[PDB]
Structure 1
Amino acid sequence: GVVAAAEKTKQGGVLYVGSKTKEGVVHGVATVAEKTKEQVTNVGGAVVTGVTAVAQKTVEGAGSIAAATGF
């Protein structure tokens, strides 16, 4: 069936961000529906979201997503 497996076996830079916004509306991962059966959202990584969203070295590993929606 639906199987997810992730293995991480580890045997063994200036970033300046400046923002100045008077008004800001930010939407990240958004799923919108009126009539649906399944609305599954799977997050294995990063969904860093904001007016000044900064992501630095977020997803650096074994990630597995298995979805069997429907049937």
Structure 2
Amino acid sequence: GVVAAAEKTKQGGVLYVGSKTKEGVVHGVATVAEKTKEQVTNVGGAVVTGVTAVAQKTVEGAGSIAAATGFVK
């Protein structure tokens, strides 16, 4: 019995980034495995991956994540 819910109702800065680089190698989320049952992901926020990875104001509301497994009985 898996339920997940979010309401956002409404009744009504500066950033300078400069990267001068050479040779980046960037990974985001990785799950790596061998011989597995499940590999879930739920991204109810964000996954931001960049050499210059700016995430402004990123979740401004109402994330809802359920996740389950199990119940072998």
TM-score (norm 1): 0.92
What's the offset of the Cα at 1:14? 1.6
| Structure 2 residues without counterparts, runs of 5 or longer | none
Q: Distance in 2 between matches of 1:69 and 1:27?
A: 27
1:67 matched residue in structure 2: 67
Aligned-residue sequence identity (percent) comes to 100
Cα RMSD between the aligned structures?
A: 1.0
1:20-59 Cα distance to aligned partner (Å, 9 max, x none): 1210010111111011100010001111111000111110
**8 Å Cα contact 1:38/1:69 also seen in 2:** no
Higher percent of residues as strand: 2
What's the offset of the Cα at 1:70? 3.3
Tell me which stretches of 4 or more aligned residues in structure 1 moved more than 6 Å.
none
What's the offset of the Cα at 1:68? 1.2
1:54 aligns with 2:51: no
